[PDB]
Design a protein around this nucleic acid. Structure first.
Lengths: 772, 103, 51, 54, 276
RNA sequence: GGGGGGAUGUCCGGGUCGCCCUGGGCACCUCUCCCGGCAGCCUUCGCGGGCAGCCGUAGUCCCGGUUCAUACGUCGCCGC
């Protein structure tokens, strides 16, 4: 295979500003209650400063980015708060989990509630006040009556209500006397007591019911530099009533909350603290601050309520802006997003015993596509679509000609205010389709000269887009769940070729059997939105694949008498175990007129479907998940995509690159280790002691090891039915592997994206905190 | 004028010698930044091999980790590069064929 | 400069400069390479700058 | 953007304007953003940005 | 140590002595046991032993192996008979190489100990509650607090009296004071040379430094001036204990060496003075 | 770096003309020991000695791609 390493695609990193998990803590259950906690959908929301709200799935240590909802130009995201209802019980003893909703603020006077199913904003709410800077939900004591409390710039604690899926501005609790008092943080002590952190060196404790002012904790000046006000950038509340507070001196102040006074000041960071996180029981404090520095705090032995800094470390690369913790289903993690666009997860209960993990800052969708016939590669971000031509092969180059070999060909600019959600291209590059969350537009390309081929009947936008390899069918996924398809008739004329798309002819999806308590509880029909859409090589067969593991296909029946109809084996095609992370058809056709549908899902689970036969291919009968190679079973990285050759399929995650020979069959990390949701165990340099040995028998020869704690016949039948795999890691920040032409030989564009200090925003330093 | 050209020929000799080492290494496939054309590069510089030893704080030395070596190699790599893999590579025997854009 | 050569850190002082700053240091070295009272320090910073 | 308001001298005739934020998201306030940015970098000055460039 | 044998407390000597190179053992001696030259064996451990100290009384003793630490609690209380002097020993690896260590007792019963191991990477680990973490097969997780200021190996770490302050001193010629209640440090930065050894008076008022350039000073706390000063001959010395920072393969490994003759004159008109 | 080999590709007299080889030019992989460094285990108080050794080059499950900087005591104005 032939590779072009490409680093000139400047994907603009966005500073991550907020994270929020669905649940803060799940109740501890043993092994005989795993059925009591299987069906709960914990999701992690991340808001980047380009208005980018993303949902990830922890996957017991999988960390797969499900959904990207982008906002328009000049829109940012400050706060993210999930609200989760208590566990309601059915009439027959079945359990209904809470219905979780997502709220966000955008440096506006507005709170926006996002519809996670529709993959867009649901409602806006605006009261007459300042622009909101911080907000939080009243926790449970009542049950049906929980309220958002938002502190803003002018000071006035506004109070919003959320009942029966409604978001309206209820009232204003108070406002501080001074107008220059700005509210920068908020966290709740109990059901009726709110703790707000205020930029006049103040931490006010208000009471929600009468809207009164219980007390006003204060802090002195900062004596490190000028700017005589300190600023309490974050507060949080321990379970035993005490309040932790990160401030602008790089301190952390522990306030006892029975009297609202300070009981400890701990100097850790050099510049200002930006975010905190608490353990679920209240033993560990995580403090992330603008010295790109994260510190871990534990109680001192002996006296009560007294904390001290165990250890600190520079995890990120820019200032650590936000973090949120989670402790449930045998996974104790805290995720911290900074300004380097890369969320780092850290194990909580085993912190210092297991490594952290930097999730990929590049998006999970490959976001790079190519028309291999025209040698066009293409990428997109906020409102522009960039197209490069390559003009040559590489056999010719097997030094001074490569600058001219690559070529910045085209930049398509999109009008309006929305952002490009998805894009796709024909094989010859003449037909480009781009979908915002409000529209979808076609561009005809001429070798440049671009024209806007108009869609009609849309106006609701779409989340996914694919084009037929014979350039006759534009299929898109509108509103997430509603898949629509459209014929395009290509009409020739003396000037050239023209294209006209018909009205969208909607095709219906299968009614799966799903219980009503599952449909209602959790997130509802959130996983119904389809993640990948894929044609066959001859555009006779389409398929879509959702977030749940259902893969629904369609077959084209002709006489334009062509129409897409449901495949009769689609009921036979089963639900996968998890989200299908990559799904495409084989380019090399079979012998029976059927197809080979290669589908890999986030548990590294590979398979190949015979869709018209509705069962697994015989290769897939032969090669079960325990027969995959170990360097593919322990990658800890979701495979971003695949590229095709005859019998070799190459896979690429974010850091890895594999090839598998589909023809043949097959013959470090430890499997049995029970770890947290982040990485493996330390082997060399850890603060915790590894080999604790007890010594009886004073002669020193009898020691003891003290542990530190708190289908056989199916394979017979399959072989009665009767290598080449190569891995590498030497392409580290892979964002796009895209094949080009011009076991067969094949060129490819490997578009990487390593970050750099010219790609991050700028640091800032006073006279006292110069780094080394 | 003898001491003039003594200085000149000394600096060009030492650059050609570092170039001998660097060309042998680029032939082996260590993938450093090598010049190709017949004129001199302006700064008479080459990229030496990345040492197997690092400097920790405050003054101790430890053996480099292959992870960090790969990090520095990906740093040293340029913008555009053709990196052809062969069947001997997929078998596990030989190395790749690399040409990077001459920065 | 003499103290920064006595401590082994003149390379450390020079290695992170910018274009206008390095033009300035070249300009000072050029102006004061003439005087034999500090031609030694001047040619040392000149060597490190060319390197 | 939105059309400016025509004044005949005593009254003001203006077109109401709400076609900006249909269902995507509201627009972020640049002044509040810069205000929070200033409170972040009260008196600090950035390090030199990059490598060797004018 | 001063321990009660039956009803008369007296000295017991605990010696750490080798039997192979990389191993050693601990032997206890009364005066009578040392007169007959037979001792009570306590524990033989097998990883390049450095030191051995003991908490007041003789309840807990601590042995400094290179990468590990051995804790020993005496098995029976009250020490009924002399022959029943046995220490159950627990061992565990400290993440660094042990340069020095100081223990302090949480108390006439010994409730707990709190140890500070200054490790030659430049770290100062604080293990909070060792006996309460090791009395109980299985043990709960322990996690040493890391205080890192020095660059080279710290030469001495000691707790100061009431236990608020963790004072320390290394090769950077600076007596640092870790506040340990807040997160702050405060320090006496400019001595003459490397801080080789420190101690605290019985009262918490006086510190005492043994300075590497053949010196010692008794300081009064919060006066921070040398109330007592003693200096010696300060020549080149081939030290028997080689170095505390020659253990971790620095850039220039410091060697016990003499290169050149000492430059020294006896001055006339005051022959009792010598310039060197 | 040296000494040597086993095997990779090549032109000049070439050879019945093929397996390749000798004479010249050679670049790579493999083995071999001596060179420079590191570590462990025994003997010696040490000086030294003995033993099976690794590293001298390249890209990772995640990841050390870390951890680390030197105080107070009093400020200002003018003169020699």
């Amino acid at each position: 295979m032939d590779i072009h390493r490409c680093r000139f695609v400047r994907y603009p990193a966005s500073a991550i500003n907020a994270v929020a998990f669905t649940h803060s803590a799940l109740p501890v259950v043993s092994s005989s209650k795993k059925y009591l906690q299987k069906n709960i959908q914990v999701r992690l929301a991340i808001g980047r400063a380009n208005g980018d709200i993303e949902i990830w799935n922890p996957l017991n240590g999988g960390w797969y980015q499900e959904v990207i909802i982008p906002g328009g130009k000049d829109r940012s995201v400050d706060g993210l708060v999930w609200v989760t209802d208590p566990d309601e019980e059915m009439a027959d003893g079945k359990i209904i989990h809470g219905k979780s909703r997502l709220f966000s603020i955008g440096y506006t006077t507005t709170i926006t509630e996002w519809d996670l199913e529709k993959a867009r904003a649901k409602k806006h709410a605006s009261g007459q006040h300042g622009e909101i800077w911080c907000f939080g939900v009243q926790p449970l004591p009542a049950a049906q009556n929980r309220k958002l409390v938002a502190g803003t710039v002018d000071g006035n604690l506004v109070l919003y209500s959320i009942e029966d899926g409604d978001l309206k501005f209820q009232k204003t609790l108070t406002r501080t006397p001074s107008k220059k008092t700005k509210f920068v943080s908020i966290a709740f002590q109990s059901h009726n007591i709110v703790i707000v952190g205020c930029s006049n060196s103040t931490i006010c404790a208000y009471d929600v019911r009468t809207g009164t002012m219980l007390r006003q904790m204060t802090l002195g000046t900062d004596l490190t530099g000028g700017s005589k006000n300190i600023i309490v950038w974050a507060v949080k509340c321990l379970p035993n009533g005490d309040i932790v507070s990160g401030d602008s001196t790089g301190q952390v102040c522990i306030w006892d909350g029975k009297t609202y006074t300070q009981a400890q000041r701990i100097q850790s960071h050099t510049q200002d603290v930006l975010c905190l996180s608490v353990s679920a029981d209240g033993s560990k404090i995580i403090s992330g601050g603008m010295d790109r520095r994260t510190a871990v705090y534990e109680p001192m032995a002996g006296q009560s309520g007294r904390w001290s800094k165990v250890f600190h470390r520079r995890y990120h690369q820019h200032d650590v802006k936000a973090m949120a913790s989670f402790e449930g289903k045998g996974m104790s993690v805290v995720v911290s997003g900074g300004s380097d666009a890369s969320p780092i997860v850290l194990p909580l209960r085993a912190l210092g015993k297991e490594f952290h993990r930097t999730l990929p800052h590049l998006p999970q969708h490959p976001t790079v596509l190519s028309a291999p016939k025209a040698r066009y590669i293409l990428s997109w971000w906020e409102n522009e679509i960039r197209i490069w031509h390559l003009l040559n092969s590489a056999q010719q180059f097997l030094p001074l000609n490569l600058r001219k070999n690559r070529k910045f060909l085209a930049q398509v600019l999109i009008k309006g205010a929305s952002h490009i959600t998805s894009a796709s291209i024909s094989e010859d590059g003449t037909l480009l389709a781009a979908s915002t969350p409000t529209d979808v537009k076609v561009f005809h390309l001429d070798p440049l000269y671009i024209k806007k081929v108009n869609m009609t009947g849309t106006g609701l936008g779409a989340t996914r887009v694919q084009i037929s390899p014979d350039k006759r069918w534009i299929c898109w996924a509108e509103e997430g769940s509603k898949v629509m398809i459209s014929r395009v008739h290509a009409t020739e004329s003396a000037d050239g070729i023209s294209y006209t798309v018909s009205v969208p002819h909607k095709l219906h999806r299968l009614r799966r059997q799903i219980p009503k308590h599952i449909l209602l509880g959790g997130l509802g029909s959130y996983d119904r939105n389809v993640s990948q859409i894929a044609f066959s090589a001859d555009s006779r067969m389409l398929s879509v694949a959702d977030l749940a593991g259902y893969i629904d296909t369609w077959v084209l029946r002709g006489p334009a008498g062509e129409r897409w109809a449901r495949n009769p084996k689609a009921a036979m095609i089963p639900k996968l175990s998890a989200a299908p992370v990559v799904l495409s058809f084989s380019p090399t056709p079979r012998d029976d007129g059927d197809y080979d549908l290669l589908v890999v899902t986030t548990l590294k689970q590979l398979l190949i479907f015979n869709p018209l036969r509705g069962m697994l291919s015989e290769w897939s009968r032969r090669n079960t998940y325990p027969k995959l190679p170990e360097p593919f079973r322990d990658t800890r990285d979701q495979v971003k995509g695949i590229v095709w050759q005859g019998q070799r399929a190459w896979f690429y995650g974010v850091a890895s690159l594999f090839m598998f020979d589909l023809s043949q069959d097959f013959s470090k990390r430890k499997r049995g280790a029970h770890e947290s949701g982040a990485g493996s165990k330390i082997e060399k340099h850890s603060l915790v002691p590894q080999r604790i040995r007890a010594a009886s028998a004073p002669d020193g020869t009898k020691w003891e090891d003290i542990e530190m704690v708190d289908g056989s016949e199916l394979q017979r039948l399959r072989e009665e039915n009767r290598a080449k795999w190569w891995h590498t890691y030497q392409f580290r920040p892979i964002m796009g592997i895209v094949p080009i032409e011009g076991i067969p030989p094949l060129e490819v564009a490997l578009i990487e994206r390593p970050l750099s200090e010219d790609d991050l925003p700028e640091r800032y330093f006073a006279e006292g905190e110069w780094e080394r | 004028e003898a001491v003039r050209l003594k200085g000149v020929i000394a600096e060009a000799a030492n650059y050609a010698k570092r170039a001998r080492r660097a060309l042998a290494d680029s032939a082996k496939g260590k993938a450093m930044t090598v010049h190709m054309s017949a004129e001199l590069p302006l700064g008479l510089k080459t990229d030496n091999k990345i040492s197997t030893e690092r400097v920790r704080s405050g003054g101790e030395i430890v053996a480099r980790s292959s992870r960090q070596i790969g990090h520095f190699i990906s740093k040293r790599r340029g913008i555009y590069s053709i990196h052809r893999i062969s069947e001997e590579m997929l078998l596990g025997a030989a190395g790749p064929t690399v040409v990077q854009e001459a920065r | 400069l003499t103290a920064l050569r006595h401590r082994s850190a003149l390379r450390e002082a020079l290695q992170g400069r910018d274009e206008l700053s390095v033009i300035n240091i070249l300009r000072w070295a050029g102006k004061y390479v003439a005087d034999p009272r500090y031609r030694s320090i001047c040619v040392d910073v000149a060597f490190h700058l060319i390197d | 953007k939105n059309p400016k308001d025509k004044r005949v001298g005593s009254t003001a005739y203006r077109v109401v304007s709400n076609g900006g934020d249909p269902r995507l998201a509201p627009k972020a306030k640049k002044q509040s953003l810069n205000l929070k940015q200033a409170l972040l970098r009260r008196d600090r000055v950035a390090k030199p940005r990059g490598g060797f460039f004018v | 140590d001063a321990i009660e044998v039956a009803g008369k407390v007296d000295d017991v000597l605990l010696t750490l002595n080798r039997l192979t190179k990389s191993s050693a053992q601990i032997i206890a001696y009364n005066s009578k046991m040392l007169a007959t030259k037979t001792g009570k064996l306590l524990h033989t451990y097998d990883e390049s032993p450095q030191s051995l100290r003991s908490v007041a009384g003789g309840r807990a003793i601590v042995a400094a192996a290179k990468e590990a630490l051995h804790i020993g609690i005496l098995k029976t209380k009250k020490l009924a008979s002399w022959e029943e002097l046995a220490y159950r020993f627990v061992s565990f690896d400290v993440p660094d190489i042990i340069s020095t260590f100081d223990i302090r007792p949480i108390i006439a019963e010994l409730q707990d100990i709190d140890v500070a191991v200054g490790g030659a990477r430049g770290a100062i680990y604080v293990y909070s509650n060792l006996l309460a973490h090791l009395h109980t097969l299985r043990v709960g997780t322990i996690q040493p607090r890391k205080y890192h200021w020095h660059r080279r190996a710290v030469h001495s770490v000691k707790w100061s009296g009431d236990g608020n302050y963790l004072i320390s001193g290394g090769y950077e010629t600076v007596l640092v004071l870790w506040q340990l209640d807040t997160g702050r440090v405060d320090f006496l930065p400019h001595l003459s040379a490397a801080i080789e050894n420190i101690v605290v008076s019985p009262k918490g008022s006086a510190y005492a430094l043994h300075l590497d350039d053949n010196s010692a000073m008794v300081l009064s706390t919060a006066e921070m001036k040398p109330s007592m000063y003693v200096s010696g001959i300060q020549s080149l010395v081939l030290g028997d204990r080689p170095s505390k920072d020659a253990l971790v393969r620095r850039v220039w490994r410091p060697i016990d060496e003499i290169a050149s003759p000492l430059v020294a004159t006896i001055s006339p008109q005051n022959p009792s003075h010598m310039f060197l």
